[PDB]
Amino acid sequence: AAPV
Amino acid sequence: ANIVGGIEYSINNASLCSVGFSVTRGATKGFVTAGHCGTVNATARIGGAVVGTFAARVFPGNDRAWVSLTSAQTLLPRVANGSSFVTVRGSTEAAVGAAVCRSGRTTGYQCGTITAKNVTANYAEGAVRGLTQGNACAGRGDSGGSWITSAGQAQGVMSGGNVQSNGNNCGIPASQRSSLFERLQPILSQYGLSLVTG
Incomplete structure (x- = not known):
């Protein structure tokens, strides 16, 4: 997961 | 600008994010968005026009922010x-x-x-x-x-x-x-x-  | 959930806005003429929800704080108009999209006082633009600035945010920990808009924006x-x-x-x-x-x-x-x-x-x-x-x-x-x-x-x-x-x-x-x-x-x-x- 990564911001968006 | 007409403020509707989902539309694009830019922060300090660099990043892009989307509008979350139109909200009010007393007589102040604003929208809630992601905290990672800007820092307090960063400037938000919609279709190349300044609409307001980040009034607060929390990121990381949480991921939230609200941008206070100018009087001229239309919240929907x-x-x-x-x-x-x-x-x-x-x-x-x-x-x-x-x-x-x-x-x-x-x-x-x-x-x-x-x-x-x-x-x-x-x-x-x-x-x-x-x-x-x-x-x-x-x-x-x-x-x-x-x-x-x-x-x-x-x-x-x-x-x-x-x-x-x-x-x-x-x-x-x-x-x-x-x-x-x-x-x-x-x-x-x-x-x-x-x-x-x-």
Whole structure:
């Protein structure tokens, strides 16, 4: 997961 | 500008994010968005015009912010769905298994279901706790956008996800997607905001  | 959930806005003429929800704070107009989209006092623009600045944010830990707008903006109780609109009716929180949709400037309006609550995302900047997980897809640029039920109950704003090399998680099966949103409830009480509804 990564911001968006 | 007409403020509607899902539309694009830029921050300090560099990043792009999406509008979450129109809200008010006493006589002040604003919108809630993602905290990672800007720092306090960063300038927000809509279609090249300055509309307001970040008044507060929390990121990482949480992922929230509100931008206070100028007097001239028009707040609307709506979320973009293509050329149509979903009317915001309130903020009842849906449970795991509820169907939900999200709107943002990169993938448009996508729907899926909530799969888990209280998830931790380990972002490079630090952990973000308490996120809700849905399986609607999303891409780079959707952050801060609206998460809402078809019935008009606002759920929260787009935080992050397992984006692939094409910039979204739309090319992987729903079963493998992790799209996370920050709950709206704690954002409204933390900043004393009221949602605009219709």
